[PDB]
Amino acid sequence: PPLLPARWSSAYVSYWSPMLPDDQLTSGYCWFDYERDICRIDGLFNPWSERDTGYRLWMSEVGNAASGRTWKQKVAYGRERTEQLCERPLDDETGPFAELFLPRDVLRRLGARHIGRRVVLGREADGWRYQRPGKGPSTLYLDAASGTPLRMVTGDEASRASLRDFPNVSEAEIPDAVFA
Amino acid sequence: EPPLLPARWSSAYVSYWSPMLPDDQLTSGYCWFDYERDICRIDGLFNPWSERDTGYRLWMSEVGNAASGRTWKQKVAYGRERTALGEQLCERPLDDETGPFAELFLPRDVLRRLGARHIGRRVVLGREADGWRYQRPGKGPSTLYLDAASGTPLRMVTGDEASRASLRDFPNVSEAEIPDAVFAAKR
Ligand SMILES: O=C(O)C(=O)Cc1ccccc1
Ligand SMILES: O=C(O)C(=O)Cc1ccccc1
Ligand SMILES: O=C(O)C(=O)Cc1ccccc1
Protein backbone atom coordinates (compact mmCIF):
# COMPACT_ATOMS: atom_id res chain seq x y z
CA PRO A 1 0.00 0.00 0.00
CA PRO A 2 1.57 3.27 -1.29
CA LEU A 3 1.82 6.81 0.09
CA LEU A 4 0.43 9.88 -1.64
CA PRO A 5 2.85 12.44 -3.14
CA ALA A 6 4.64 14.74 -0.62
CA ARG A 7 2.79 17.74 -2.07
CA TRP A 8 0.07 17.99 -4.74
CA SER A 9 -2.53 20.48 -5.97
CA SER A 10 -5.23 20.01 -8.61
CA ALA A 11 -8.44 21.34 -9.93
CA TYR A 12 -11.19 19.00 -8.71
CA VAL A 13 -14.62 17.94 -9.98
CA SER A 14 -17.12 16.75 -7.40
CA TYR A 15 -20.31 14.71 -7.93
CA TRP A 16 -22.42 11.70 -6.98
CA SER A 17 -23.19 8.09 -7.95
CA PRO A 18 -25.90 7.79 -8.90
CA MET A 19 -26.79 11.42 -9.68
CA LEU A 20 -30.14 12.05 -8.05
CA PRO A 21 -32.25 15.05 -9.29
CA ASP A 22 -30.96 17.44 -6.58
CA ASP A 23 -27.35 16.22 -6.75
CA GLN A 24 -24.88 18.88 -7.88
CA LEU A 25 -21.81 18.68 -10.10
CA THR A 26 -19.22 21.23 -8.86
CA SER A 27 -15.57 22.31 -9.33
CA GLY A 28 -12.78 24.01 -7.41
CA TYR A 29 -9.08 23.83 -6.71
CA CYS A 30 -7.29 22.15 -3.79
CA TRP A 31 -3.73 22.05 -2.34
CA PHE A 32 -2.17 19.41 -0.05
CA ASP A 33 1.30 20.09 1.47
CA TYR A 34 2.10 17.06 3.65
CA GLU A 35 5.41 18.54 4.75
CA ARG A 36 3.62 21.45 6.41
CA ASP A 37 0.72 19.09 7.26
CA ILE A 38 -1.77 21.51 5.75
CA CYS A 39 -4.39 21.67 2.99
CA ARG A 40 -6.64 24.24 1.26
CA ILE A 41 -9.83 23.69 -0.77
CA ASP A 42 -11.76 26.38 -2.64
CA GLY A 43 -15.14 25.71 -4.20
CA LEU A 44 -18.89 25.55 -3.91
CA PHE A 45 -19.57 23.16 -1.05
CA ASN A 46 -20.86 19.76 -2.17
CA PRO A 47 -23.22 18.53 -0.79
CA TRP A 48 -25.15 21.59 0.32
CA SER A 49 -28.93 21.88 0.55
CA GLU A 50 -30.30 25.17 -0.82
CA ARG A 51 -33.66 23.58 0.02
CA ASP A 52 -32.89 23.44 3.77
CA THR A 53 -30.58 26.42 4.29
CA GLY A 54 -31.94 28.85 1.70
CA TYR A 55 -28.55 29.19 -0.03
CA ARG A 56 -25.61 27.63 -1.84
CA LEU A 57 -22.34 27.98 0.01
CA TRP A 58 -19.04 28.88 -1.51
CA MET A 59 -16.14 28.03 0.81
CA SER A 60 -12.37 28.35 1.03
CA GLU A 61 -11.09 26.11 3.82
CA VAL A 62 -7.54 26.06 5.19
CA GLY A 63 -7.08 22.94 7.30
CA ASN A 64 -3.95 22.90 9.42
CA ALA A 65 -3.43 19.40 10.91
CA ALA A 66 -0.17 20.49 12.60
CA SER A 67 -2.09 23.01 14.77
CA GLY A 68 -5.36 21.02 14.68
CA ARG A 69 -7.38 24.08 13.64
CA THR A 70 -9.27 24.67 10.42
CA TRP A 71 -10.17 28.10 9.01
CA LYS A 72 -13.05 28.75 6.65
CA GLN A 73 -13.95 31.74 4.53
CA LYS A 74 -17.58 31.53 3.46
CA VAL A 75 -19.95 33.29 1.05
CA ALA A 76 -23.69 32.57 0.73
CA TYR A 77 -25.59 32.59 -2.58
CA GLY A 78 -29.36 32.93 -1.98
CA ARG A 79 -32.25 33.07 -4.46
CA GLU A 80 -34.54 36.10 -4.47
CA ARG A 81 -37.45 37.12 -6.67
CA THR A 82 -37.65 40.49 -8.43
CA GLU A 83 -35.18 35.57 -10.23
CA GLN A 84 -31.65 36.45 -9.08
CA LEU A 85 -28.82 35.29 -6.83
CA CYS A 86 -28.09 37.31 -3.66
CA GLU A 87 -24.50 37.21 -2.53
CA ARG A 88 -23.79 37.66 1.20
CA PRO A 89 -20.66 36.61 3.00
CA LEU A 90 -20.86 34.81 6.32
CA ASP A 91 -18.51 34.99 9.29
CA ASP A 92 -15.18 33.24 9.02
CA GLU A 93 -15.18 30.04 11.08
CA THR A 94 -12.61 27.99 13.04
CA GLY A 95 -12.93 24.56 14.65
CA PRO A 96 -11.06 21.32 15.34
CA PHE A 97 -9.14 19.57 12.54
CA ALA A 98 -7.89 16.09 13.46
CA GLU A 99 -6.33 15.23 10.09
CA LEU A 100 -6.14 16.33 6.44
CA PHE A 101 -8.98 15.35 4.08
CA LEU A 102 -6.67 12.82 2.42
CA PRO A 103 -3.88 11.92 4.87
CA ARG A 104 -0.66 10.97 3.03
CA ASP A 105 -0.62 7.56 4.77
CA VAL A 106 -4.39 6.82 4.56
CA LEU A 107 -3.99 3.59 2.54
CA ARG A 108 -1.61 2.12 5.12
CA ARG A 109 -3.41 3.21 8.28
CA LEU A 110 -6.84 1.98 7.15
CA GLY A 111 -5.44 -1.18 5.52
CA ALA A 112 -6.34 -0.69 1.86
CA ARG A 113 -6.63 -3.64 -0.51
CA HIS A 114 -6.00 -3.56 -4.25
CA ILE A 115 -9.38 -4.31 -5.91
CA GLY A 116 -7.97 -4.24 -9.44
CA ARG A 117 -7.42 -1.71 -12.20
CA ARG A 118 -9.58 0.87 -13.94
CA VAL A 119 -9.07 3.54 -16.59
CA VAL A 120 -9.85 6.81 -14.79
CA LEU A 121 -9.63 10.23 -16.51
CA GLY A 122 -7.88 8.50 -19.47
CA ARG A 123 -5.08 7.19 -17.20
CA GLU A 124 -4.57 3.62 -16.00
CA ALA A 125 -5.24 3.55 -12.25
CA ASP A 126 -4.88 1.38 -9.15
CA GLY A 127 -8.09 0.97 -7.13
CA TRP A 128 -7.46 1.00 -3.39
CA ARG A 129 -10.50 0.08 -1.26
CA TYR A 130 -10.50 0.90 2.46
CA GLN A 131 -13.08 1.13 5.24
CA ARG A 132 -13.60 4.48 6.95
CA PRO A 133 -14.25 3.47 10.59
CA GLY A 134 -17.97 3.41 11.52
CA LYS A 135 -18.68 5.40 8.33
CA GLY A 136 -18.42 3.06 5.30
CA PRO A 137 -16.23 1.97 2.35
CA SER A 138 -14.02 4.19 0.21
CA THR A 139 -11.99 3.72 -2.94
CA LEU A 140 -8.94 5.81 -3.83
CA TYR A 141 -7.74 5.63 -7.42
CA LEU A 142 -4.07 6.43 -7.88
CA ASP A 143 -2.38 6.83 -11.23
CA ALA A 144 -0.82 3.40 -11.75
CA ALA A 145 2.46 4.98 -12.95
CA SER A 146 2.99 8.51 -11.40
CA GLY A 147 1.16 7.50 -8.17
CA THR A 148 -0.77 10.84 -7.99
CA PRO A 149 -4.54 10.71 -7.17
CA LEU A 150 -7.14 10.49 -9.96
CA ARG A 151 -10.47 9.84 -8.17
CA MET A 152 -11.68 9.70 -4.54
CA VAL A 153 -14.82 7.58 -3.88
CA THR A 154 -16.51 8.04 -0.49
CA GLY A 155 -19.16 5.33 -0.27
CA ASP A 156 -20.09 2.42 -2.52
CA GLU A 157 -20.25 3.54 -6.17
CA ALA A 158 -22.57 0.58 -6.80
CA SER A 159 -25.25 1.92 -4.41
CA ARG A 160 -24.53 5.50 -3.20
CA ALA A 161 -21.26 7.52 -3.15
CA SER A 162 -19.51 10.87 -3.52
CA LEU A 163 -16.92 11.06 -6.29
CA ARG A 164 -14.11 13.60 -6.53
CA ASP A 165 -11.96 13.66 -9.67
CA PHE A 166 -8.52 15.27 -9.99
CA PRO A 167 -7.82 16.03 -13.69
CA ASN A 168 -4.60 18.11 -13.45
CA VAL A 169 -2.52 17.22 -10.39
CA SER A 170 0.69 19.22 -10.02
CA GLU A 171 3.36 18.01 -7.57
CA ALA A 172 5.01 21.43 -7.63
CA GLU A 173 6.27 23.84 -5.00
CA ILE A 174 3.36 25.49 -3.12
CA PRO A 175 4.16 29.12 -2.08
CA ASP A 176 3.55 30.09 1.56
CA ALA A 177 0.86 32.63 0.58
CA VAL A 178 -1.56 29.90 -0.53
CA PHE A 179 -1.96 28.83 3.13
CA ALA A 180 -1.66 32.32 4.74
CA GLU B 1 -10.13 58.58 -14.72
CA PRO B 2 -10.25 54.79 -14.06
CA PRO B 3 -7.36 52.77 -12.62
CA LEU B 4 -5.34 49.96 -14.10
CA LEU B 5 -6.08 46.48 -12.74
CA PRO B 6 -3.48 45.05 -10.30
CA ALA B 7 -0.27 44.10 -12.18
CA ARG B 8 -0.89 40.48 -11.13
CA TRP B 9 -3.88 38.91 -9.31
CA SER B 10 -5.31 35.44 -8.70
CA SER B 11 -8.55 34.27 -7.01
CA ALA B 12 -11.25 31.65 -6.62
CA TYR B 13 -14.23 32.69 -8.70
CA VAL B 14 -17.94 31.97 -8.57
CA SER B 15 -19.71 32.38 -11.89
CA TYR B 16 -23.44 32.89 -12.47
CA TRP B 17 -26.10 34.96 -14.22
CA SER B 18 -28.59 37.80 -13.73
CA PRO B 19 -31.43 36.92 -13.90
CA MET B 20 -31.00 33.21 -13.20
CA LEU B 21 -32.97 31.44 -15.94
CA PRO B 22 -33.85 27.69 -15.72
CA ASP B 23 -30.76 26.27 -17.51
CA ASP B 24 -28.36 28.77 -15.83
CA GLN B 25 -25.59 27.23 -13.71
CA LEU B 26 -23.74 28.40 -10.61
CA THR B 27 -20.16 27.26 -10.95
CA SER B 28 -16.84 27.84 -9.24
CA GLY B 29 -13.16 27.42 -9.99
CA TYR B 30 -9.87 29.33 -9.76
CA CYS B 31 -8.13 31.86 -12.03
CA TRP B 32 -4.67 33.48 -12.36
CA PHE B 33 -3.81 36.74 -14.16
CA ASP B 34 -0.29 38.07 -14.89
CA TYR B 35 -0.28 41.28 -16.95
CA GLU B 36 3.49 41.66 -17.27
CA ARG B 37 3.59 38.15 -18.73
CA ASP B 38 0.41 38.90 -20.77
CA ILE B 39 -0.98 35.49 -19.73
CA CYS B 40 -4.01 34.09 -17.80
CA ARG B 41 -5.19 30.70 -16.47
CA ILE B 42 -8.74 29.64 -15.51
CA ASP B 43 -9.77 26.22 -14.10
CA GLY B 44 -13.47 25.36 -13.71
CA LEU B 45 -16.63 23.80 -15.07
CA PHE B 46 -17.21 25.93 -18.15
CA ASN B 47 -20.10 28.41 -17.76
CA PRO B 48 -22.16 28.74 -19.94
CA TRP B 49 -22.18 25.30 -21.51
CA SER B 50 -25.01 23.63 -23.42
CA GLU B 51 -25.19 20.03 -22.24
CA ARG B 52 -28.32 19.68 -24.43
CA ASP B 53 -26.40 20.52 -27.60
CA THR B 54 -23.10 18.78 -26.82
CA GLY B 55 -24.07 15.73 -24.77
CA TYR B 56 -22.03 16.68 -21.67
CA ARG B 57 -20.90 19.22 -19.08
CA LEU B 58 -17.36 20.48 -19.71
CA TRP B 59 -14.61 20.97 -17.17
CA MET B 60 -11.72 22.96 -18.62
CA SER B 61 -8.33 24.42 -17.75
CA GLU B 62 -7.34 27.15 -20.26
CA VAL B 63 -4.00 28.98 -20.48
CA GLY B 64 -4.35 32.06 -22.70
CA ASN B 65 -1.15 33.81 -23.74
CA ALA B 66 -1.92 37.18 -25.36
CA ALA B 67 1.82 37.77 -25.91
CA SER B 68 2.36 34.62 -28.03
CA GLY B 69 -1.24 34.81 -29.32
CA ARG B 70 -1.86 31.16 -28.41
CA THR B 71 -4.24 29.31 -26.10
CA TRP B 72 -4.04 25.81 -24.58
CA LYS B 73 -7.17 24.03 -23.26
CA GLN B 74 -7.29 20.85 -21.17
CA LYS B 75 -10.79 19.34 -21.40
CA VAL B 76 -12.80 16.71 -19.53
CA ALA B 77 -16.35 15.73 -20.53
CA TYR B 78 -18.94 14.65 -17.93
CA GLY B 79 -21.76 12.79 -19.64
CA ARG B 80 -24.98 11.43 -18.20
CA GLU B 81 -25.48 7.71 -18.59
CA ARG B 82 -28.61 5.63 -17.94
CA THR B 83 -27.66 2.65 -15.75
CA ALA B 84 -29.25 -0.08 -13.62
CA LEU B 85 -28.52 2.38 -10.77
CA GLY B 86 -30.72 4.99 -12.48
CA GLU B 87 -28.03 7.25 -13.86
CA GLN B 88 -24.40 8.09 -13.41
CA LEU B 89 -21.76 10.50 -14.68
CA CYS B 90 -19.10 9.30 -17.06
CA GLU B 91 -15.89 11.25 -17.31
CA ARG B 92 -14.16 11.30 -20.69
CA PRO B 93 -11.01 13.38 -21.27
CA LEU B 94 -11.05 15.08 -24.61
CA ASP B 95 -7.95 15.92 -26.60
CA ASP B 96 -6.05 19.01 -25.41
CA GLU B 97 -6.86 21.96 -27.63
CA THR B 98 -4.61 24.74 -28.90
CA GLY B 99 -5.47 27.79 -31.01
CA PRO B 100 -5.42 31.60 -31.47
CA PHE B 101 -5.82 33.97 -28.54
CA ALA B 102 -6.30 37.72 -29.21
CA GLU B 103 -6.53 39.37 -25.76
CA LEU B 104 -6.72 38.46 -22.07
CA PHE B 105 -10.22 37.86 -20.69
CA LEU B 106 -9.96 40.98 -18.53
CA PRO B 107 -7.17 43.25 -19.80
CA ARG B 108 -5.39 45.41 -17.24
CA ASP B 109 -6.24 48.67 -19.05
CA VAL B 110 -9.82 47.63 -19.90
CA LEU B 111 -11.52 50.41 -17.92
CA ARG B 112 -9.23 53.04 -19.42
CA ARG B 113 -9.32 51.90 -23.06
CA LEU B 114 -13.09 51.21 -23.02
CA GLY B 115 -13.79 54.60 -21.39
CA ALA B 116 -15.30 53.52 -18.07
CA ARG B 117 -17.15 55.97 -15.85
CA HIS B 118 -17.49 55.81 -12.09
CA ILE B 119 -21.18 55.05 -11.46
CA GLY B 120 -20.96 54.92 -7.66
CA ARG B 121 -19.91 52.81 -4.70
CA ARG B 122 -21.48 49.53 -3.62
CA VAL B 123 -20.75 46.78 -1.12
CA VAL B 124 -19.65 43.69 -3.02
CA LEU B 125 -18.63 40.50 -1.18
CA GLY B 126 -18.79 42.41 2.14
CA ARG B 127 -16.30 44.99 0.83
CA GLU B 128 -16.79 48.61 -0.22
CA ALA B 129 -16.23 48.64 -3.97
CA ASP B 130 -16.07 51.14 -6.84
CA GLY B 131 -18.34 50.50 -9.83
CA TRP B 132 -16.89 51.23 -13.28
CA ARG B 133 -19.33 51.12 -16.19
CA TYR B 134 -18.27 50.83 -19.83
CA GLN B 135 -19.36 49.65 -23.27
CA ARG B 136 -17.78 46.73 -25.14
CA PRO B 137 -18.16 48.23 -28.65
CA GLY B 138 -20.65 46.17 -30.69
CA LYS B 139 -21.40 43.83 -27.76
CA GLY B 140 -23.04 45.50 -24.73
CA PRO B 141 -22.40 47.26 -21.39
CA SER B 142 -20.25 46.02 -18.52
CA THR B 143 -19.57 46.95 -14.93
CA LEU B 144 -16.38 46.04 -13.08
CA TYR B 145 -16.43 46.37 -9.31
CA LEU B 146 -13.01 47.00 -7.74
CA ASP B 147 -12.02 46.91 -4.07
CA ALA B 148 -12.17 50.63 -3.22
CA ALA B 149 -9.14 50.41 -0.92
CA SER B 150 -6.97 47.81 -2.70
CA GLY B 151 -8.04 48.22 -6.33
CA THR B 152 -8.48 44.45 -6.75
CA PRO B 153 -11.37 42.89 -8.73
CA LEU B 154 -14.47 41.80 -6.81
CA ARG B 155 -17.23 41.33 -9.42
CA MET B 156 -17.24 41.26 -13.20
CA VAL B 157 -20.61 42.02 -14.79
CA THR B 158 -20.83 41.25 -18.50
CA GLY B 159 -24.08 42.70 -19.77
CA ASP B 160 -26.79 44.66 -18.03
CA GLU B 161 -27.86 43.00 -14.76
CA ALA B 162 -31.39 44.39 -15.04
CA SER B 163 -31.96 42.43 -18.26
CA ARG B 164 -29.15 39.89 -18.86
CA ALA B 165 -25.63 39.64 -17.47
CA SER B 166 -23.04 37.15 -16.39
CA LEU B 167 -21.57 37.75 -12.94
CA ARG B 168 -18.14 36.48 -11.85
CA ASP B 169 -17.21 37.08 -8.17
CA PHE B 170 -13.66 36.95 -6.82
CA PRO B 171 -13.89 36.27 -3.04
CA ASN B 172 -10.17 35.89 -2.14
CA VAL B 173 -7.96 37.82 -4.62
CA SER B 174 -4.26 37.56 -3.96
CA GLU B 175 -1.64 39.98 -5.30
CA ALA B 176 1.21 37.53 -4.61
CA GLU B 177 3.70 36.46 -7.25
CA ILE B 178 2.44 33.69 -9.55
CA PRO B 179 4.98 30.86 -10.06
CA ASP B 180 5.85 30.21 -13.72
CA ALA B 181 4.71 26.58 -13.53
CA VAL B 182 1.04 27.75 -13.10
CA PHE B 183 1.18 28.78 -16.77
CA ALA B 184 3.09 25.64 -17.94
CA ALA B 185 0.29 24.58 -20.37
CA LYS B 186 0.80 20.81 -19.92
CA ARG B 187 -1.75 18.72 -17.92
O1 LIG C 1 -16.53 17.39 -1.72
C1 LIG C 1 -16.65 18.57 -2.12
O2 LIG C 1 -16.88 18.82 -3.32
C2 LIG C 1 -16.55 19.70 -1.16
O3 LIG C 1 -17.55 20.34 -0.91
C3 LIG C 1 -15.21 20.00 -0.49
C4 LIG C 1 -14.92 21.41 0.03
C5 LIG C 1 -14.27 21.55 1.27
C6 LIG C 1 -13.96 22.82 1.78
C7 LIG C 1 -14.30 23.96 1.04
C8 LIG C 1 -14.95 23.84 -0.19
C9 LIG C 1 -15.24 22.57 -0.71
O1 LIG D 1 -13.01 14.28 3.04
C1 LIG D 1 -13.68 15.28 2.68
O2 LIG D 1 -14.67 15.66 3.35
C2 LIG D 1 -13.29 16.02 1.46
O3 LIG D 1 -13.82 17.08 1.19
C3 LIG D 1 -12.23 15.47 0.53
C4 LIG D 1 -11.87 16.36 -0.65
C5 LIG D 1 -10.58 16.25 -1.19
C6 LIG D 1 -10.21 17.05 -2.27
C7 LIG D 1 -11.12 17.95 -2.82
C8 LIG D 1 -12.42 18.05 -2.30
C9 LIG D 1 -12.79 17.26 -1.21
O1 LIG E 1 -17.15 32.36 -16.92
C1 LIG E 1 -16.92 31.19 -16.53
O2 LIG E 1 -17.50 30.74 -15.52
C2 LIG E 1 -16.00 30.33 -17.28
O3 LIG E 1 -16.42 29.26 -17.66
C3 LIG E 1 -14.57 30.77 -17.62
C4 LIG E 1 -13.60 29.63 -17.96
C5 LIG E 1 -12.65 29.82 -18.98
C6 LIG E 1 -11.74 28.80 -19.30
C7 LIG E 1 -11.76 27.58 -18.60
C8 LIG E 1 -12.70 27.39 -17.58
C9 LIG E 1 -13.61 28.41 -17.26
Ligand SMILES: O=C(O)C(=O)Cc1ccccc1
Ligand atom coordinates in the same frame (compact mmCIF):
# COMPACT_ATOMS: atom_id res chain seq x y z
O1 LIG F 1 -14.72 37.44 -20.35
C1 LIG F 1 -14.67 36.18 -20.33
O2 LIG F 1 -15.08 35.50 -21.31
C2 LIG F 1 -14.11 35.48 -19.16
O3 LIG F 1 -14.09 34.25 -19.14
C3 LIG F 1 -13.56 36.28 -18.00
C4 LIG F 1 -13.20 35.49 -16.74
C5 LIG F 1 -12.40 36.11 -15.78
C6 LIG F 1 -12.05 35.44 -14.62
C7 LIG F 1 -12.51 34.15 -14.39
C8 LIG F 1 -13.32 33.52 -15.33
C9 LIG F 1 -13.66 34.19 -16.51
